[PDB]
Design a protein around this motif. Sequence first.
Motif, PDB file in Angstrom:
ATOM      1  N   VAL A   4      17.313  10.286 -22.479  1.00  7.65           N
ATOM      2  CA  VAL A   4      17.457  11.724 -22.275  1.00  7.65           C
ATOM      3  C   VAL A   4      18.074  11.945 -20.909  1.00  7.65           C
ATOM      4  CG1 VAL A   4      16.250  13.824 -21.880  1.00  7.65           C
ATOM      5  CG2 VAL A   4      15.655  12.509 -23.788  1.00  7.65           C
ATOM      6  N   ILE A   5      19.034  12.854 -20.827  1.00  3.48           N
ATOM      7  CA  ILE A   5      19.713  13.145 -19.579  1.00  3.48           C
ATOM      8  C   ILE A   5      19.780  14.650 -19.396  1.00  3.48           C
ATOM      9  CG2 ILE A   5      21.068  11.102 -19.130  1.00  3.48           C
ATOM     10  CD1 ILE A   5      23.278  12.296 -20.677  1.00  3.48           C
ATOM     11  N   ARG A   6      20.465  15.063 -18.335  1.00  2.00           N
ATOM     12  CA  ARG A   6      20.637  16.472 -18.056  1.00  2.00           C
ATOM     13  C   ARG A   6      21.796  17.004 -18.877  1.00  2.00           C
ATOM     14  NH1 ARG A   6      19.417  17.928 -12.714  1.00  2.00           N
ATOM     15  NH2 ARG A   6      20.762  16.263 -11.876  1.00  2.00           N
ATOM     16  N   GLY A   7      22.089  18.273 -18.722  1.00  2.00           N
ATOM     17  CA  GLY A   7      23.104  18.889 -19.541  1.00  2.00           C
ATOM     18  C   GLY A   7      24.508  18.470 -19.194  1.00  2.00           C
ATOM     19  N   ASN A   8      24.878  18.643 -17.937  1.00 10.37           N
ATOM     20  CA  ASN A   8      26.235  18.402 -17.484  1.00 10.37           C
ATOM     21  C   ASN A   8      26.548  16.942 -17.223  1.00 10.37           C
ATOM     22  OD1 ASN A   8      24.295  18.612 -15.536  1.00 10.37           O
ATOM     23  ND2 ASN A   8      25.591  19.623 -14.018  1.00 10.37           N
ATOM     24  N   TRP A  39      22.422  15.658 -28.551  1.00  7.58           N
ATOM     25  CA  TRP A  39      22.130  16.983 -29.078  1.00  7.58           C
ATOM     26  C   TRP A  39      21.094  17.686 -28.223  1.00  7.58           C
ATOM     27  CZ3 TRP A  39      20.032  12.602 -30.940  1.00  7.58           C
ATOM     28  CH2 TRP A  39      18.668  12.578 -31.122  1.00  7.58           C
ATOM     29  N   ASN A  40      21.475  18.816 -27.642  1.00 14.67           N
ATOM     30  CA  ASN A  40      20.606  19.589 -26.758  1.00 14.67           C
ATOM     31  C   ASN A  40      19.231  19.806 -27.357  1.00 14.67           C
ATOM     32  OD1 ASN A  40      19.332  22.382 -26.350  1.00 14.67           O
ATOM     33  ND2 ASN A  40      20.567  22.173 -24.499  1.00 14.67           N
ATOM     34  N   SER A  41      18.201  19.400 -26.626  1.00 17.55           N
ATOM     35  CA  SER A  41      16.831  19.616 -27.070  1.00 17.55           C
ATOM     36  C   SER A  41      16.021  20.062 -25.869  1.00 17.55           C
ATOM     37  CB  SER A  41      16.214  18.384 -27.695  1.00 17.55           C
ATOM     38  OG  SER A  41      14.840  18.610 -27.921  1.00 17.55           O
ATOM     39  N   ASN A  42      15.863  21.368 -25.703  1.00 17.22           N
ATOM     40  CA  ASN A  42      15.026  21.902 -24.641  1.00 17.22           C
ATOM     41  C   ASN A  42      13.941  22.755 -25.265  1.00 17.22           C
ATOM     42  OD1 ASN A  42      16.044  24.575 -24.980  1.00 17.22           O
ATOM     43  ND2 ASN A  42      15.969  24.920 -22.773  1.00 17.22           N
ATOM     44  N   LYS A  43      13.763  22.627 -26.570  1.00 11.48           N
ATOM     45  CA  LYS A  43      12.665  23.229 -27.286  1.00 11.48           C
ATOM     46  C   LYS A  43      11.449  22.326 -27.272  1.00 11.48           C
ATOM     47  CE  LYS A  43      12.348  22.889 -31.691  1.00 11.48           C
ATOM     48  NZ  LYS A  43      10.910  22.624 -31.891  1.00 11.48           N
ATOM     49  N   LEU A  44      11.638  21.062 -26.901  1.00 15.21           N
ATOM     50  CA  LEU A  44      10.594  20.055 -26.845  1.00 15.21           C
ATOM     51  C   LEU A  44      10.518  19.405 -25.477  1.00 15.21           C
ATOM     52  CD1 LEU A  44      11.842  20.040 -29.881  1.00 15.21           C
ATOM     53  CD2 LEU A  44      10.429  18.069 -30.228  1.00 15.21           C
ATOM     54  N   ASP A  45      11.304  19.855 -24.511  1.00 15.21           N
ATOM     55  CA  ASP A  45      11.385  19.163 -23.235  1.00 15.21           C
ATOM     56  C   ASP A  45      11.130  20.029 -22.020  1.00 15.21           C
ATOM     57  OD1 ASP A  45      11.845  16.685 -24.159  1.00 15.21           O
ATOM     58  OD2 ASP A  45      13.924  16.546 -23.466  1.00 15.21           O
ATOM     59  N   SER A  46      11.283  21.340 -22.097  1.00 16.74           N
ATOM     60  CA  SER A  46      11.072  22.177 -20.934  1.00 16.74           C
ATOM     61  C   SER A  46       9.755  22.913 -21.088  1.00 16.74           C
ATOM     62  CB  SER A  46      12.203  23.177 -20.798  1.00 16.74           C
ATOM     63  OG  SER A  46      12.309  23.923 -21.999  1.00 16.74           O
TER      64      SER A  46
END
Lengths: 49, 49
Positions: A4-8, A39-46
């Motif tokens: 898992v990494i950051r967005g940019n 695939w962006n996953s910030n529903k389970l990570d933030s």
Amino acid sequence: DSFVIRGNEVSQIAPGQTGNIADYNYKLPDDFTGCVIAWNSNKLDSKVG
Amino acid sequence: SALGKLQDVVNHNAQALNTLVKQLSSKFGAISSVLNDILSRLDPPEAEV
């Protein structure tokens, strides 16, 4: 290989690209054949906080 | 110019070597003629082309 990494920084997992995650903690060759799936996953990570 | 033929063979050979050695300085479209600069001021992906 899964992580898992950051967005940019998804752009940095590519052949021959220099950065901060590519030169220090995950590096793939220049003759790499295969591919990447992010695939962006910030529903389970933030969390709040 | 009684000895034109022998003098001419010598001069042609010398000129051929001269042009072959001199053409190493030409760039042929690359950003620089010396190999070291190409490998110093550019990442491997662009240094290849």
